[PDB]
Amino acid sequence: SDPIKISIPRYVLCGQGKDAHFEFEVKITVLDETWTVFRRYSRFREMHKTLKLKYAELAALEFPPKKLFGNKDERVIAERRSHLEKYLRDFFSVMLQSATSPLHINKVGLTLSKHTICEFSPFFKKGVFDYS
């Protein structure tokens, strides 16, 4: 009844020195299949810019800006985690509603599986550190 579930349960520190940055643990579930990808903010933002020019309705979504107080402060990172989570959830909400989308709700007896999502955007494909 609710075909695509997503959460961001935690964020992890990657890299060493000043090249160290945060990635977000994205847990995705479609039907009864779950997998997890690690994605930094930049990758979310590029995903949004890329997909917005292909599906105009996404422009009604507010993407979270990166915040000028303290990239060093984990409280900032935690707020960002919450916001990215809400964003992904709304992203799929819109993509389930929009008729010209490959994700649209009319495929939910048919062709919507891990595969539809993974192909829909390289953002959701299992790459290196990602896992199922």
Author numbering: 1181 to 1312
Paper text:
We have also obtained two crystal structures of SGK3 and SNX23 (for which previous structures exist), as well as a crystal structure of SNX15, the crystal structure of SNX32 (in complex with a peptide from the bacterial IncE peptide) and the NMR structure of SNX25. PX domains are found in a wide variety of proteins with diverse functions, including cell signalling (e.g., PLD1 and 2, PIKC2α, β, and γ), vesicle trafficking (e.g., SNXs 1, 2, 3, 5, and 6), protein scaffolding (e.g., SH3PXD2A and B), and cytoskeletal transport (SNX23/KIF16B).
The Phox homology (PX) domain was first identified in the NADPH phagocyte oxidase complex subunits p40phox and p47phox, and has since been found in proteins in every eukaryotic species from yeast to human. Despite relatively low overall sequence homology, PX domains all possess the same core fold, consisting of three antiparallel β-strands (β1-β3), followed by three α-helices (α1–α3). An extended sequence traverses the protein between helices α1 and α2, termed the PPK loop as it generally contains a conserved ΨPxxPxK motif (Ψ = large aliphatic amino acids V, I, L, and M). Side chains of residues from the β3 strand, α1 helix and PPK loop together form a binding pocket for the headgroup of the canonical lipid PtdIns3P.
